[PDB]
């Protein structure tokens, strides 16, 4: 593996940008074939089957993806703080799901309910309709620039959309379309 991989590089005479697809047998990331491949990469995206069964596409695992340029001195401070703030609340969501199993949903404190409500809305907003999947979903694709991506999550973290249902954040592009979807949902009710 090492002999072949070392030839795909950007030397001082030119540049090569490579994208490689890797298969994991039986969803086991400790298998010797994918295990000895993490060392040869600069950015990884891990797809998961649990997320796909909820209906969220693309099924990217948000707590198991990494990059090398995720540094405050390369992408700025605002972009860095937003991502770390998202990951922290997504990690905190998991611990609350053990309590709900034994004692019901309504016995939780109000702060826990607010945390869960914000986390569920954050989870939906990460999905997006693609352009090559118009046959499957039946919608037209979307593209989102970077500034809208930062601002939409910063606003949801602030708490400016606590008066909207979850369904308005599902399969949309920018943040401006969720309220326009909620207004139509209200009109059709």
């Amino acid at each position: 593996m090492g002999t072949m991989q070392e030839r795909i590089t950007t030397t001082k005479k030119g540049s090569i940008t490579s994208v490689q697809a890797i298969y994991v047998p039986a969803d086991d990331l400790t298998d010797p074939a994918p295990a000895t491949t993490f060392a040869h990469l600069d950015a990884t995206t891990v797809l998961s089957r649990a997320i796909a069964e909820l209906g969220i596409y693309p099924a990217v695992d948000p707590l198991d993806s990494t990059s090398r340029i995720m540094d405050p001195n390369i992408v700025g401070s605002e972009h860095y703080d937003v991502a770390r703030g998202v990951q922290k609340i997504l990690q905190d969501y998991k611990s609350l799901q053990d309590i709900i199993a034994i004692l019901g949903m309504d016995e939780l404190s109000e702060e826990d309910k607010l945390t869960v409500s914000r986390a569920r809305k954050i989870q939906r907003f990460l999905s997006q309709p693609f352009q090559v999947a118009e046959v499957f979903t039946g919608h037209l694709g979307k593209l989102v620039p970077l500034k809208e991506t930062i601002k939409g999550f910063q606003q949801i973290l602030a708490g400016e959309y606590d008066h909207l249902p979850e369904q308005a954040f599902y399969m949309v592009g920018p943040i401006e379309e969720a309220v326009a979807k909620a207004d139509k949902l209200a009109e059709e009710h």
Binding site: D98, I99, A101, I102, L103, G104, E107
Partner: protein, 272 residues
Amino acid sequence: ATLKDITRRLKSIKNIQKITKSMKMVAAAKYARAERDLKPARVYGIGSLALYEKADIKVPEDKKKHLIIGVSSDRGLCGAIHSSVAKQIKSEVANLTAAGKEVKIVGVGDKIRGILHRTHSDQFLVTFKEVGRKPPTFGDASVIALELLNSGYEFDEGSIIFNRFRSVISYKTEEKPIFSLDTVASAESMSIYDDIDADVLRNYQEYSLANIIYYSLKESTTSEQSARMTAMDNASKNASEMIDKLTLTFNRTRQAVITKELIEIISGAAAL
């Protein structure tokens, strides 16, 4: 029967046990305070009912129907606390309908409304909510009594059902009669009191209703807490029992995997 399934199933119960274990102490801490405040309210509750005790009053055979009140909370995981009350609530109505009355049932506590909704949906007069989260107070009994009189329904008889705290490991279900009807109150035995009037008796019955309601609530809360503590103890005992067999199964499978994977290497080395 693979190693992954055993590992996941072990890791779930390991968390369930700790959740139950942490939930036991909170019920003990609440039970301490619930027991502390019962003694001052017991003398008040007994003192409210002395007059009816001394001068016996018996209701006649009328047809103004009853007013059955059942007390409970909005939380589960307390053994058979609610089922015992809901058992007698439906028992009394059969005898009441044998004579024939327009009886109605009022329940404070959501579980009581939920259990008996299917078969007694029409008899429901009014129900309350937000009970058990915080300790009860006299103002809640005042609110319930105030909202009970404004109803156009009128009754000649009534009863209230509750659980009475007896010991840290036992309790008894009981009910007490209500003679709040003015007409039945005015009987021969009341002639000894010689400064009475209709207005005075109306106010007196009004106050006795709130007194009985407050006494019943302060009796029921302690029994509910003392039952939840025992339930949360038994659940952790069962979880500790399960996590002991799963470990032995895990160890046996772990050894078997190593032996099976070594045999293949030896066999593929010998055939060269």
